[PDB]
Design a binder for this molecule. Structure first.
Ligand SMILES: O=C(O)[C@]1(F)CN(c2ncnc3[nH]c4cc(F)ccc4c23)CC12COC2
Length: 167
């Protein structure tokens, strides 16, 4: 038993809710919250900008030190940093950004990072400002992640569509 509430069960291991991931993290304080990161960990907008804002920019400060030491992530890659006031840990995962011309096949590699964590609160990778089809992203999630994932979908209209079209 865990503390996630109000989710619809899609599969054995994948759950979904119409929720603001920031507000959900603040209430659950999960072990792992996933950020929709870019390779530079520049948390300007989308989910990343919202998570970083909720940390009062501490996420960005930590991220800048990480990049100064390690260089950029790979598209499809990840790193574990602090969850600050939102979670124990933040798993920064880089899905391909279609608005940058990145290969959508890298979306499966991005979701594979979730399998290193038993339970996660996460957004749909490559959705939103990353330009991928969220229905495709949900399908890849279900077909790739084997650990327990709680997906927060900000937009109510999209949430209803994802549920109603789910096979
Ligand atoms: O338009 C988009 O880019 C998205 F809708 C944003 N995403 C989110 N997903 C969960 N929680 C969220 N909280 C937020 C708070 C904000 F200020 C901004 C965004 C989100 C968000 C998912 C989305 C990207 O694929 C759909």
């Amino acid at each position: 038993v865990n503390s996630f509430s109000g989710y619809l069960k899609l599969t054995d291991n994948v759950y979904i809710k119409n929720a603001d991931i920031v507000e959900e993290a603040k209430k659950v304080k999960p072990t792992v919250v996933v950020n929709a990161a870019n390779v530079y960990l520049k948390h300007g907008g989308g989910v990343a900008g919202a998570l970083n804002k909720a940390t009062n920019n501490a996420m960005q400060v930590e991220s800048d030190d990480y990049i100064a030491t390690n260089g950029p992530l790979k598209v499809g890659g990840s790193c574990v940093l602090s969850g600050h006031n939102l979670a124990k840990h933040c798993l920064h995962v880089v899905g391909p950004n279609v608005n940058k011309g990145e290969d959508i096949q890298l979306l499966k590699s991005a979701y594979e990072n979730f399998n290193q964590h038993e339970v996660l609160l996460a957004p749909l990778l490559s959705a939103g400002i990353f330009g991928a089809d969220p229905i495709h992203s949900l399908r890849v999630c279900v077909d790739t992640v084997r650990t327990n994932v709680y997906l927060a979908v900000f937009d109510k209209n999209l949430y209803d569509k994802l549920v109603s079209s789910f096979l």
